[PDB]
Design a protein around this motif. Sequence first.
Motif, mmCIF file in Angstrom:
data_model
loop_
_atom_site.group_PDB
_atom_site.id
_atom_site.type_symbol
_atom_site.label_atom_id
_atom_site.label_comp_id
_atom_site.label_asym_id
_atom_site.label_seq_id
_atom_site.Cartn_x
_atom_site.Cartn_y
_atom_site.Cartn_z
ATOM 1 N N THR A 144 -20.346 61.211 73.963
ATOM 2 C CA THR A 144 -20.363 60.577 75.243
ATOM 3 C C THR A 144 -20.913 59.213 74.977
ATOM 4 N N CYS A 145 -20.186 58.209 75.427
ATOM 5 C CA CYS A 145 -20.614 56.836 75.256
ATOM 6 C C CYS A 145 -21.517 56.439 76.444
ATOM 7 N N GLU A 146 -22.828 56.483 76.307
ATOM 8 C CA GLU A 146 -23.663 56.271 77.513
ATOM 9 C C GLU A 146 -23.849 54.842 77.981
ATOM 10 N N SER A 147 -23.885 53.882 77.059
ATOM 11 C CA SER A 147 -23.675 52.490 77.449
ATOM 12 C C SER A 147 -23.504 51.542 76.263
ATOM 13 N N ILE A 148 -22.974 50.355 76.513
ATOM 14 C CA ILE A 148 -22.686 49.432 75.436
ATOM 15 C C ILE A 148 -23.527 48.196 75.565
ATOM 16 N N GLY A 149 -24.516 48.209 76.439
ATOM 17 C CA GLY A 149 -25.339 47.038 76.552
ATOM 18 C C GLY A 149 -24.423 45.938 77.010
ATOM 19 N N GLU A 150 -24.510 44.777 76.353
ATOM 20 C CA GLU A 150 -23.936 43.510 76.806
ATOM 21 C C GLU A 150 -23.300 42.827 75.621
ATOM 22 N N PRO A 151 -22.076 43.201 75.289
ATOM 23 C CA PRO A 151 -21.561 42.870 73.960
ATOM 24 C C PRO A 151 -21.227 41.397 73.741
ATOM 25 N N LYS A 152 -21.321 40.903 72.516
ATOM 26 C CA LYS A 152 -20.705 39.618 72.195
ATOM 27 C C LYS A 152 -19.380 39.877 71.461
ATOM 28 N N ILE A 153 -18.305 39.300 71.980
ATOM 29 C CA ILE A 153 -16.987 39.516 71.470
ATOM 30 C C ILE A 153 -16.452 38.150 71.190
ATOM 31 N N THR A 154 -15.728 38.017 70.090
ATOM 32 C CA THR A 154 -15.145 36.773 69.686
ATOM 33 C C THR A 154 -13.738 37.106 69.255
ATOM 34 N N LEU A 155 -12.784 36.230 69.534
ATOM 35 C CA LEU A 155 -11.460 36.400 69.048
ATOM 36 C C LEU A 155 -11.242 35.244 68.102
ATOM 37 N N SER A 156 -10.556 35.463 66.992
ATOM 38 C CA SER A 156 -10.232 34.355 66.161
ATOM 39 C C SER A 156 -9.503 33.289 67.006
ATOM 40 N N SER A 157 -9.689 32.033 66.652
ATOM 41 C CA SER A 157 -9.271 30.938 67.521
ATOM 42 C C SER A 157 -7.774 30.746 67.573
ATOM 43 N N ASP A 158 -7.063 31.235 66.581
ATOM 44 C CA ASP A 158 -5.594 31.302 66.673
ATOM 45 C C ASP A 158 -5.123 32.231 67.803
ATOM 46 N N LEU A 159 -5.778 33.373 67.921
ATOM 47 C CA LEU A 159 -5.439 34.341 68.913
ATOM 48 C C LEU A 159 -5.830 33.808 70.286
ATOM 49 N N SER A 160 -7.042 33.279 70.369
ATOM 50 C CA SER A 160 -7.579 33.023 71.680
ATOM 51 C C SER A 160 -6.815 31.816 72.216
ATOM 52 N N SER A 161 -6.368 30.998 71.281
ATOM 53 C CA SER A 161 -5.507 29.906 71.595
ATOM 54 C C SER A 161 -4.095 30.377 72.025
ATOM 55 N N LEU A 171 -10.402 43.350 82.594
ATOM 56 C CA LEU A 171 -11.184 42.802 81.492
ATOM 57 C C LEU A 171 -12.407 43.649 81.142
ATOM 58 N N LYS A 172 -13.478 43.443 81.890
ATOM 59 C CA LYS A 172 -14.676 44.254 81.766
ATOM 60 C C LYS A 172 -14.351 45.657 81.219
ATOM 61 N N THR A 173 -13.494 46.354 81.954
ATOM 62 C CA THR A 173 -13.161 47.743 81.699
ATOM 63 C C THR A 173 -12.473 47.932 80.355
ATOM 64 N N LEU A 174 -11.699 46.945 79.952
ATOM 65 C CA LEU A 174 -10.959 47.052 78.726
ATOM 66 C C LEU A 174 -11.911 46.831 77.541
ATOM 67 N N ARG A 175 -12.785 45.853 77.698
ATOM 68 C CA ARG A 175 -13.724 45.511 76.673
ATOM 69 C C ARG A 175 -14.651 46.691 76.404
ATOM 70 N N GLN A 176 -15.108 47.294 77.497
ATOM 71 C CA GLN A 176 -15.902 48.510 77.480
ATOM 72 C C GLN A 176 -15.172 49.638 76.758
ATOM 73 N N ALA A 177 -13.933 49.901 77.129
ATOM 74 C CA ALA A 177 -13.248 51.040 76.538
ATOM 75 C C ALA A 177 -13.064 50.854 75.017
ATOM 76 N N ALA A 178 -12.813 49.631 74.570
ATOM 77 C CA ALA A 178 -12.612 49.431 73.157
ATOM 78 C C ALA A 178 -13.913 49.797 72.396
ATOM 79 N N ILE A 179 -15.041 49.164 72.761
ATOM 80 C CA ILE A 179 -16.343 49.517 72.209
ATOM 81 C C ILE A 179 -16.598 51.034 72.242
ATOM 82 N N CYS A 180 -16.310 51.694 73.353
ATOM 83 C CA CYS A 180 -16.565 53.147 73.395
ATOM 84 C C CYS A 180 -15.698 53.925 72.423
#
Length: 208
Positions: A144-161, A171-180
């Motif tokens: 059971t993933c009880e919490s993920i705190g407050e993550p720092k996420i970075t995308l390589s700049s080619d992608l984010s570009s 968003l929120k929900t997706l970022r959370q699910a990946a970490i979990c």
Amino acid sequence: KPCKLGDMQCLSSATEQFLEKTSKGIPQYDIWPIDPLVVTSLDVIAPSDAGIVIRFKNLNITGLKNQQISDFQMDTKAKTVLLKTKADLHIVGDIVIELTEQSKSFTGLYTADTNVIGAVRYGYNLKNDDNGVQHFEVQPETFTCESIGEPKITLSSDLSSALEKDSGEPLKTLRQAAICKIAEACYISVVHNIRASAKILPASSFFE
Ligand SMILES: [Zn+2]
Ligand SMILES: [Zn+2]
Ligand SMILES: [Zn+2]
Ligand SMILES: [Zn+2]
């Protein structure tokens, strides 16, 4: 060194201690390297839209050597284990953000620094050696993933570009699910090693 049945605090340290000592592996004992931990791939569905799939490849995860086993309950008549942890995970891997309903994908690198809190539950039973010695045998667990705190996420700049240039929670929900999901693979691995120590040592070893 053994504990005494009952002393939950003794355990957490033995485990933490086991996890740190063995965390880089021990093939002959089937103890897996879990720091760094490598995940060949992991896929994740956007909770707010199943047409969106995050495909991770080559996740490289550090931090698990040091996680704290901050709570440990062993129930003897039900013979089950509850345990809670926290890990600071540094995660790096390839990512493909797949927009299936649009027929496209975006690619690059992903990095996540996050503190994760979780719960592992499993039951166990006692069973005998060929010589008639008792081991614990730990059964398939749940995480059971009880919490993920407050993550720092970075995308390589080619992608984010690329992402910016296209769109120029979910968003929120997706970022959370990946970490979990990632935390979950991390702990399938942790418990694998707990399960494996249990094969390597008589039940008698683990208590006085
Ligand atoms: Zn194994
Ligand atoms: Zn601790
Ligand atoms: Zn950190
Ligand atoms: Zn044995």
